């Protein structure tokens, strides 16, 4: 009964007044029994919300604003006490309330997941609870330039001073909880707007997906604020010296922080590869091309002015359209007739992990401030230059064990970590000769390959498509690195036989299945496939034998369905698709498999005036391909007019006519 909930909220409100407040004689001042009150609040979290799976206390604590109005004041004032004392050297007690404040922050910032195992109460309360965590993240990053962050590192430093052995289990746990605090503060992110599907949709959809609370803007939550507050509290320095000092109880949270820093930021944004106004002028010219295009597709006179075109077909029958531009351009008339159809084919549809490169829209970017850009790129630079190989060895040498018990989230975050920093160092080393590929040498050490192979193989066998996609990305970066070191050169030949047979088959099977999965899944399949083919060509077991495993129709469907997003794709992605087509069609000469109308449609749309950029390099590749493709299609139809029907359909898997269809004698 809700009587219990209002009683609980009354209790937490009374506890909220017990913690402390401002003293007018303004400074924050602790309450009587304040340590016992903090312990009792920790006990409320345990006693009710954990033990009964409710999150009611986690809601009530936010209602009475304890985190923002008591705990961060306590920690920041305690930080100032200890800072001033350090310069000028009953802290034995106040240390305890600082620690219990940190425990409460770790609890209240603890990441939220919703599953079939969650209670009905939890999944009901999930949204507003996420919103309150976002207010917490804003306050933690903003308040006194986030001085509580230095409070957290100081609490950790006061057990890093003592010996490696002298750090007791309590000290080890305390350092781990400090890492979980920083991880959580990175990890809070706006929740998904999750809708009941029993009742039908109205005549309009959801009015907005925005789930922020009114006192928050997205910039308050953005990475930029994280970088600024972490720099101004030297959290980056703390993490860098911590990973340098590793010489392993805390290694998994320490990896996890770097994952949460990397999961959604693109490496190219840290490299350039009147400047802002100049580039804005470039952007505006580019969209002005689309303006002149739609203007060509627009009437010179008012909408009520419309006369009627009639398209008499090649047969003695007539259609009718009102388009004034179409009246003098039959292309527009035909396509407008097709646009007018009310009918569509109905299309069928298609969680405990955060948003990332695994599931973001493919053009998403963090727009850094240049100070934060410098601070972040130099932080991850110094990490790579110190902490990478040691950390990766520590955690991968963990993950050699306990693979059967590795939780799905842990698997995907490990794979993303691997991929992200390997990709970054490859890119930086392409940009700087001063940067060295050997600085990520741990990636190529054979245990790492074996584990990544075990992860991808088990994920695919389990049909865990999330982790399969993660391992697919990690494999792409492993192969990418392999190609770079094959040029920069032994271990290359080791992995180039260890990946034989069933691994070749597995890699050949992802782009068969990819057509059934999201754009990013398909993109990673294409990326992996391009890397695989360039690797095998660089080596060249037999080259014809392997590529035959790729040149099959579901792979062509996956490439087509990827290419169907052509406007939203990037020039390099289209280049990779058309290099694959160059191989299949020009080099391998299995041209019959691409004589199908879906490709014809897609080629026309992208070569259209409202298709690709006229100046695009990828448009040049498409044009080159299309010229050769049309010439061969004309030639095959001239030799075989049955293909005028066959163009409509999948090719005949009946070999006895299929060979004749494929080659025409």
């Amino acid at each position: 009964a809700d009587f219990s909930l209002t009683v609980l909220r009354a209790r937490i409100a009374l506890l909220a007044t017990a913690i402390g407040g401002p003293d007018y004689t303004p400074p924050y001042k602790l309450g009587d029994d304040c340590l016992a009150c903090l312990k009792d609040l920790k006990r409320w979290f345990k006693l009710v919300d954990d033990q009964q799976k409710r999150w009611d206390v986690a809601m009530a604590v936010a209602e009475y604003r304890i985190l923002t109005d008591d705990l961060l004041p306590i920690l920041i004032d305690w930080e100032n006490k200890c800072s001033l004392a350090a310069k000028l050297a009953n802290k034995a007690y106040y240390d305890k309330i600082a620690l219990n404040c940190l425990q409460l922050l770790v609890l209240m910032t603890w990441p939220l997941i919703v599953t079939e195992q969650s209670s009905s109460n939890q999944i009901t309360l999930y949204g507003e609870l996420k919103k309150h965590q976002l207010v917490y993240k804003k306050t933690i990053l903003s308040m006194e330039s986030g001085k509580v962050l230095r409070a957290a590192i100081r609490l950790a430093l006061d057990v890093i001073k003592i010996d490696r052995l002298s750090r007791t289990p309590r000290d080890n746990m305390v350092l781990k909880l400090v890492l979980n605090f920083f991880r959580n503060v990175i990890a809070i992110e706006p929740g998904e707007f999750t809708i009941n599907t029993k009742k039908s949709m109205p005549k309009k959809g959801i009015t907005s997906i925005d789930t922020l609370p009114p006192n928050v803007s997205m910039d308050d939550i953005s990475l930029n604020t994280v970088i600024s507050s972490f720099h101004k509290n030297k959290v980056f320095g703390f993490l860098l010296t911590l990973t340098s000092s590793l010489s392993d109880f805390i290694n998994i949270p320490l990896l996890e922080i770097m994952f949460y820093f990397t999961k959604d930021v693109n490496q190219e944004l840290l490299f350039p590869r009147t400047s802002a106004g100049f580039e804005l002028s470039k952007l505006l010219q580019k969209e002005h091309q689309m303006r002149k295009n739609v203007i060509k597709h627009t009437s010179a006179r008012h909408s009520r002015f419309g006369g009627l075109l009639s398209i008499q077909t090649p047969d003695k029958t007539r259609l009718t359209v009102s388009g004034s531009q179409a009246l003098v351009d039959e292309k527009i008339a035909l396509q407008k007739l097709d646009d007018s159809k009310k009918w569509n084919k109905r299309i069928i549809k298609k969680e405990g992990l955060p948003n990332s490169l695994l599931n973001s829209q493919t053009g998403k970017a963090i727009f850094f401030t240049e100070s934060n850009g410098k601070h972040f790129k130099e932080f991850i630079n110094n990490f790579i230059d110190s902490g990478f190989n040691i950390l990766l060895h520590s955690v991968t040498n963990y993950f050699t064990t306990e693979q059967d018990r590795m939780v799905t989230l842990e698997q995907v975050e490990y794979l993303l970590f691997f991929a992200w920093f390997v990709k970054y160092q490859l890119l930086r080393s392409k940009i700087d000769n001063s940067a060295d590929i050997k600085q990520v040498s741990e990636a190529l050490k054979e245990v790492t390959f074996i584990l990544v192979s075990s992860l991808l193989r088990s994920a695919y066998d389990l049909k865990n498509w999330t982790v399969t996609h993660a391992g697919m990305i990690a494999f792409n970066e492993l192969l990418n690195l392999v190609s770079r070191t094959k040029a920069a050169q032994d271990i290359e030949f080791i992995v180039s036989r260890l990946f034989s047979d069933e691994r070749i088959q597995l890699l050949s099977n992802l782009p068969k299945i990819g057509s059934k999965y999201s754009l990013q899944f398909m993109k990673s399949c294409i990326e992996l496939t391009h890397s695989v083919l360039k690797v095998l060509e660089q080596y060249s077991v037999n080259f014809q034998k392997v590529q035959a495993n790729y040149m099959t129709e579901p792979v062509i469907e996956t490439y087509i369905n990827f290419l169907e997003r052509f406007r939203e794709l990037e020039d390099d992605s289209i280049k990779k698709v058309f290099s694959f087509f160059h191989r299949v069609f020009v080099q391998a000469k299995e041209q019959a498999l691409l004589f199908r109308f879906d490709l014809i449609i897609l080629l026309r749309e992208m070569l259209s005036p409202d298709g690709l950029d006229r100046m695009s390099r990828s448009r040049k590749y498409v044009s080159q391909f299309s010229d050769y493709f049309l010439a061969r299609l004309k030639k095959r139809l001239k030799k075989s007019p049955a293909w005028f029907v066959g163009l409509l359909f999948p090719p005949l898997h009946n070999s006895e006519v299929g060979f004749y269809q494929r080659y025409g004698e």
């Binding site: 303006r291 002149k292 203007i295 075109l309 007539r318 004034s324 531009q325 009246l327 003098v328």
Partner: protein, 138 residues
């Protein structure tokens, strides 16, 4: 073997209508109007031998202005366009759509024939109107 663009309800080929108007929008001499109407005694070469609507289109391009004013009787002077006057009077929306598009097309044709430095992007951006007048009895 091919589709045909027809002014609906009329059996008029739009392509033929377009050519019949284009070949008057260029190559028309204002002397032909003085052959059509009264004051035929006052033909004067230095005012009547100009390609009159190209003179209009070039001044119009220099001023960069969208409108071409067109006395309807001029269509009856030029041999290939006499029928198009009746098509205009009876089916004006479609014929005017054709004439607008043809003016824009001829602006492009003039700058590419002269391979001029004037902005193709301007002409492509610009909408172009014909403003036909002096149709007949008021």
């Amino acid at each position: 073997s091919e589709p045909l663009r027809i002014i609906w309800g009329t059996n008029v080929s739009i392509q033929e209508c377009t050519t019949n108007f284009r070949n008057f929008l260029m190559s028309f001499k204002y002397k032909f109007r003085k052959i059509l109407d009264e004051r035929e005694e006052f033909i004067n070469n230095t005012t009547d031998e100009e390609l009159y609507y190209i003179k209009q289109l070039n001044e119009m391009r220099e001023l960069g202005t969208s409108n071409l004013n067109l006395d309807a009787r001029n269509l009856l002077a030029y041999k290939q366009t006499e029928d198009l006057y009746h098509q205009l009077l009876n089916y004006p929306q479609e014929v005017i759509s054709i004439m607008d598009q043809t003016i824009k097309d001829c602006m492009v044709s003039l700058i590419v024939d002269n391979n001029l430095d004037y902005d193709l992007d301007e002409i492509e951006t610009k909408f172009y109107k014909v403003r036909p007048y002096n149709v007949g009895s008021c």
